[model samples]
Target: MQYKLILNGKTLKGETTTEAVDAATAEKVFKQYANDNGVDGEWTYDDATKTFTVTE
Candidate 1:
């Protein structure tokens, strides 16, 4: 299944971003994003919209 990965920025002026990927890719990308940013969050998938959101 295809999922859109979204990272909700923490800063007030930060912009939200998204990237499309499949299940396996999503896992890899999520981990990479966390390690690179030095943050930990959860991934929530919305079946209705086919989107994955990362939240702190």
Candidate 2:
């Protein structure tokens, strides 16, 4: 299984999730969505707090 990662913006491009996203599969999913939906940027992934907010 994989964790669905999230980004911030409109409805269609926002809203994703993860359990223990540290599994890296989550990050991969995040990137896949990020690139596919044009949510491009140098994202900030904080493994400590386990949050993926946009505008870093």
Candidate 3:
């Protein structure tokens, strides 16, 4: 599976593991990726738009 992410002023790409993995692992991976990519809360998903909004 694939996922979308926003980092800094750019949109980043992420992928889900095909192998067996726990939810915690996935969370950890994404969090690490976010931090490494300079992604913050402001660059997260918006329920209203159902998409990542880098700026309000």
Per-candidate TM-score against the hidden true structure = 0.50, 0.57, 0.41
Candidate order by lDDT, highest to lowest?
2, 1, 3
Prediction 1 global C-alpha lDDT? 0.59
Cα error of candidate 3 at position 11, Å: 4.5
Q: Give the per-residue Cα lDDT of candidate 3 at 50.
A: 28
Question: What are the clash counts of all predictions, listed in order?
Answer: 0, 1, 0
How close to the true structure is residue 55 of candidate 1, measured as C-alpha lDDT? Answer: 69
Deviation from native of the Cα of residue 41 in model 1, angstroms: 1.2
What is the model-wide C-alpha lDDT for candidate 2?
Answer: 0.60
| Model 2: number of backbone collisions | 1
Alpha-carbon runs more than 4 Å astray in model 1:
9-21
Model 1 per-residue lDDT tens digits across residues 1-56: 55566765453122233454556576676567655775566667676776666666
- Compare the candidates by TM-score and give the number of the best one: 2
Task: Score candidate 1 by TM-score against the native.
Answer: 0.50
- All candidates in order of TM-score, best leading: 2, 1, 3
Clashing pairs in 1: none
lDDT of 3: 0.44
Q: Give lDDT tens digits, candidate 3, residues 1-56.
A: 22333434446544323221543454456566666767554545443432333421
Model 3 lDDT-worst window of ten: 15-24
Best by lDDT: 2
